Design a binder for this molecule. Structure first.
Ligand SMILES: Nc1ncnc2c1ncn2[C@@H]1O[C@H](COP(=O)(O)OP(=O)(O)OP(=O)(O)O)[C@@H](O)[C@H]1O
Ligand SMILES: Nc1ncnc2c1ncn2[C@@H]1O[C@H](COP(=O)(O)OP(=O)(O)OP(=O)(O)O)[C@@H](O)[C@H]1O
Ligand SMILES: [Cl-]
Ligand SMILES: [Zn+2]
Ligand SMILES: [Zn+2]
Lengths: 69, 69
C-alpha cells in the first residue's frame, strides 16, 4: 500500500537525523493539515538558540503525509 | 538552507530503493507541478506488468520538492 511507503519513509527520516544542534535529541515537529513539519532542532535547543541570539539553525522541512497529492 | 535538506533527502530516497519488481533498476518518475512522483517500478518492468496482466506493483509516491508548503 503506497501511503505506508510514505509513512515508513517519514518514520525513518525522523529517526536517523537528530536535532542539527545537539546532534542527539530528535527534532521538534508539528502536524500542519496534510503535512508533517519536521523542525531543525529539538525544543530545548530551539529555546536556547533564542536566548543565545543565534538564528543559524532556525527552520523546518515539510513532508506530505500521503502517497498521492 | 532548508530546500537543500529536502533535495538531498529526495536524492537519497530515489537512490536507495530501486524498482520494487526487478529490485535493481531505479524507479520511473515524473515532475508534477511542485511534486516529484516516484513510480514503484522502472519503465521496463511497468510495461511488462501490463503484458503479463499483473497490477500488484502499480502505484507511486509523491514528494513535495520544497521545504515549505
Ligand atoms: N524547534 C525548532 N527548530 C528550528 N527552528 C524552529 C523551531 N521552531 C520554530 N522554528 C522556526 O522559527 C521560525 C519562526 O518560528 P514559527 O513558530 O513562526 O514557525 P511556525 O511553524 O510558522 O509557527 P507559527 O505558525 O506559530 O508561526 C520559523 O522559521 C520556524 O521554522
Ligand atoms: N512505472 C510505474 N510503476 C508503477 N506504477 C505505475 C508506473 N507508471 C504508472 N503507474 C501507475 O499506473 C496507474 C495508472 O497510471 P497513470 O499513467 O494513469 O499514472 P499518472 O501519473 O496518473 O499518469 P496520467 O496523468 O497520464 O494518467 C497509476 O496508479 C500509476 O501510478
Ligand atoms: Cl513529502
Ligand atoms: Zn538539540
Ligand atoms: Zn524493474
Amino acid at each position: 500500500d503506497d501511503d505506508d511507503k510514505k509513512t515508513n519513509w517519514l518514520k525513518r527520516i525522523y529517526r536517523v537525523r537528530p536535532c542539527v544542534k545537539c546532534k542527539v535529541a530528535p527534532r521538534d515537529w508539528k502536524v500542519k493539515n496534510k503535512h508533517l513539519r519536521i523542525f531543525n532542532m529539538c525544543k530545548t535547543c530551539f529555546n536556547n538558540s533564542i536566548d543565545i541570539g543565534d538564528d543559524t539553525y532556525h527552520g523546518h522541512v515539510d513532508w506530505l503525509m500521503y502517497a498521492d497529492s
